[PDB]
Design an enzyme around this catalytic site. Structure first.
Site, PDB file in Angstrom:
ATOM      1  N   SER A   1       0.803  -1.240   0.000  1.00  0.00           N
ATOM      2  CA  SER A   1       0.000   0.000   0.000  1.00  0.00           C
ATOM      3  C   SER A   1       0.836   1.291   0.000  1.00  0.00           C
ATOM      4  O   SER A   1       0.387   2.307  -0.521  1.00  0.00           O
ATOM      5  CB  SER A   1      -0.945   0.019   1.202  1.00  0.00           C
TER       6      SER A   1
ATOM      7  N   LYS B   1       1.554   3.484  -3.306  1.00  0.00           N
ATOM      8  CA  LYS B   1       0.624   4.467  -3.896  1.00  0.00           C
ATOM      9  C   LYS B   1       1.293   5.846  -3.998  1.00  0.00           C
ATOM     10  O   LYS B   1       0.968   6.609  -4.912  1.00  0.00           O
ATOM     11  CB  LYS B   1      -0.655   4.612  -3.047  1.00  0.00           C
TER      12      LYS B   1
ATOM     13  N   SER C   1      -7.423   2.774  -1.216  1.00  0.00           N
ATOM     14  CA  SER C   1      -6.409   1.866  -1.794  1.00  0.00           C
ATOM     15  C   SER C   1      -6.993   1.068  -2.968  1.00  0.00           C
ATOM     16  O   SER C   1      -7.040  -0.170  -2.940  1.00  0.00           O
ATOM     17  CB  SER C   1      -5.836   0.919  -0.737  1.00  0.00           C
TER      18      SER C   1
ATOM     19  N   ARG D   1      -1.966  -0.738  13.556  1.00  0.00           N
ATOM     20  CA  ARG D   1      -0.701  -0.101  13.145  1.00  0.00           C
ATOM     21  C   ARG D   1      -0.711   1.374  13.526  1.00  0.00           C
ATOM     22  O   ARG D   1       0.286   1.882  14.037  1.00  0.00           O
ATOM     23  CB  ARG D   1      -0.458  -0.264  11.635  1.00  0.00           C
TER      24      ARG D   1
END
Ligand SMILES: [Cl-]
Lengths: 244, 243
Positions: free
Chosen positions: B48, B51, B96, B227
């Site tokens: 991810s 990006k 995403s 996270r």
């Protein structure tokens, strides 16, 4: 074709707070405007704190401000707002409505370039009579809530007659709130002196639309910016633009 | 000292039954801090986090005109509900939207993708694998300290792409803003199973910027929230953001 619809039910947000004013909203996708008071939406007032937007744009476009990191050193004069008694950059000057920094910008831009740029922006009555570093606070300039919407829409679309860069920098400086649902760009309502009218102008960015807003209110018994923001947000929540 | 290890941050990983690394960089003091010096330098699939370079290259090459350009839904139902609609650069980053980034990568193509990653000094600069999936299952690897170096260049408009492309991507990265701080990230939401999960970006304060890059081993569930929680517990401990 009525691009302006009146919704008198929003008057309850003013009356419940013992206040008088206007809220103007513009739905970008539908190209439709809404207000509680069409007459007041078109009445022109001193821009006051809202002038930080055109002032910053002109300062960047002319190179008076090189970028959003350039430091404007404190002049050493103690003022009554603690956050003003320090060095600033474009971002923090907007965050704390540091009038002395914006006055320095206006003096450097100067009378002739300031007038030319406001004419190029089609900004309100384009009249800058008064001291070049205070005319938006006590001079001849006047702008209505509907004209604030037209000006902000051009800024949003990078359509003002200034560089795309200057427009992107000012929009960054306008950032006031962002969460998982929406972004608000404003940083325009702080009152630094006694005025007859107070403002709150800017826009709400959603995933698939943008809602522009411009509100103004008569000076009440004690409330100010906090109340202007609260009434505007009560209207946005009523129209299901932002969640409760 | 330029680099310092702070093992007390491991309490945030242990409390959440997790394993990984948090790397912080204080821009003003030009000093780095981490709970694990070895893992801070271990290189993993960017997933991810790709990006960011992918969007920058797409904008600089004109594959994406601006942040408003609409990438219309192809009408094919996918298994992530937020992907079954039109997107622009902002919402493709928010959700995403892998099919949108795959179309960017196919248009950029192998040669320009490789040249740009070399120009960015991005990780191992190796794009081995399919042009439309190498950041998910190919040869590209990047460490948490390399994510910091790349993000610092982006912050300063120092990447070898237009200042415009850099400003647009930084706008797209906006994730949180209040009266105390701004967080630019939008890099950790993952829809595909990976061995490693990330969260990278920075915190803008009035007079400083703190860059962060964290990664963790993955058990199950929507790990982004976890996270972000671990990283924010570290930021709060270091008094970067308030409690
Ligand atoms: Cl922004």
């Amino acid at each position: 074709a009525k691009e302006w619809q009146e919704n008198k039910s929003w008057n309850a947000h003013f009356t419940e707070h013992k206040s008088q004013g206007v809220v103007v909203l513009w739905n970008e996708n539908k190209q439709q405007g809404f207000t509680n008071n069409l007459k007041r939406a078109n009445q022109a007032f001193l821009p006051a704190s809202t002038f930080k937007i055109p002032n910053s744009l002109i300062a960047l476009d002319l190179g008076v401000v090189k970028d959003e990191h350039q430091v404007f050193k404190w002049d050493g004069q103690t003022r009554d707002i603690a956050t003003w008694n320090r060095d600033h950059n474009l971002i923090t000057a907007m965050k704390y409505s540091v009038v002395p920094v914006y006055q320095e910008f206006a003096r450097q831009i100067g009378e002739a370039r300031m007038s030319k740029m406001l004419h190029a922006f089609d900004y309100g009555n384009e009249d800058i009579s008064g001291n070049v570093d205070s005319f938006w606070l006590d001079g001849g300039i006047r702008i209505s809530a509907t004209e604030q919407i037209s000006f902000l829409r051009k800024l949003y679309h990078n359509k003002l007659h200034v560089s795309e860069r200057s427009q992107r920098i000012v929009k960054q400086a306008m950032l006031t709130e962002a969460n998982g649902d929406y972004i608000i760009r404003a940083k325009t309502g702080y009152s630094t002196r006694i005025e007859k009218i107070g403002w709150w102008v800017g826009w709400v960015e959603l995933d698939d639309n943008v809602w522009f807003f411009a509100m103004n209110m008569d000076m009440p018994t004690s409330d100010g910016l906090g109340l202007r923001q609260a009434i505007t947000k009560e209207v946005l929540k009523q129209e299901k633009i932002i969640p409760f």
